[PDB]
């Protein structure tokens, strides 16, 4: 699924 | 970085560490008191580390600066993932050295199929976990349009390019974010988002920091 690449991962839309 | 290697002690100098009690983003140093990073790494109370390659052990010559100011760009969209990118001001100037560089900015875009090096201190694992001591690097390609909205459809917005390989098993993934993407020595990207890491035609996507470039001088001689 659509990550941002932070720790810890964020959502985006996808 | 999946699938990268070692880049060597401060190879990468304009490299830094966002620290909130564990490394959670990355960013790239620009002058002696400006980082630039991703929108979505933003929260209260960071700690930029310069001069680091092992995050994990303190050598002596590294930098920790608090910053005194973390400014989102203001069209930053935490749904879309849009105008993913922010300028960290450092309380204190940062001392240049050899392992303390900042990184040019671009004068104008980079193109397809241009290389360009990507480094961080991100999950090395596509499935799993595991994160590194020292800095990792990858060379990538920045891929076509086509490619980028084939892998996302709907997701890409004039300020994303997609670079990476659609075989999978290369890519920057958690713990990247925020961190360069340097082509012909300039910053023309910044890590920003992807669906997983490393994965079977979803490359990562980028930041597209020639977009940005009068915002970030204007933002700089604002503050
Ligand atoms: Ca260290």
Redesign the pocket.
């Known amino acids: 699924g659509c990550w941002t690449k932070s720790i810890p991962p964020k959502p985006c839309f996808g | 970085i999946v699938g990268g290697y070692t880049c060597g002690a401060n190879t990468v100098p304009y490299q830094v560490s966002l620290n909130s009690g564990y490394h959670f983003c990355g960013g790239s140093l620009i002058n002696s008191q400006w980082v630039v990073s991703a929108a979505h790494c933003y929260k209260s109370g960071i700690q930029v580390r310069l001069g ?8 002596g010559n ?1 930098q920790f600066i608090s910053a005194s100011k973390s400014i989102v760009h203001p069209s930053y969209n935490s749904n879309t993932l849009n105008n993913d990118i922010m300028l960290i001001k450092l309380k204190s100037a940062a001392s240049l050295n050899s392992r303390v560089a900042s990184i040019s900015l671009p004068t104008s875009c980079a193109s397809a199929g241009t290389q360009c090096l990507i480094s961080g201190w991100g999950n090395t694992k596509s499935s799993g976990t595991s994160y590194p001591d020292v800095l990792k690097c990858l060379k990538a390609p920045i891929l076509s349009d086509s490619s980028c909205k084939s892998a996302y459809p709907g997701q890409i917005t004039s300020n994303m390019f997609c670079a990476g390989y659609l075989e999978g098993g290369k890519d920057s993934c958690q713990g990247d974010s925020g961190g360069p993407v340097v082509c012909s020595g300039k910053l023309q990207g910044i890590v920003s988002w992807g669906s997983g890491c490393a994965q079977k035609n979803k490359p990562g996507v980028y930041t597209k920091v020639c977009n940005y470039v009068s915002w970030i001088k204007q933002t700089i001689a604002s503050n």
Do not use: C, L, S, T
């Open positions: 680091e390659d092992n995050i994990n052990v303190v050598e590294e």
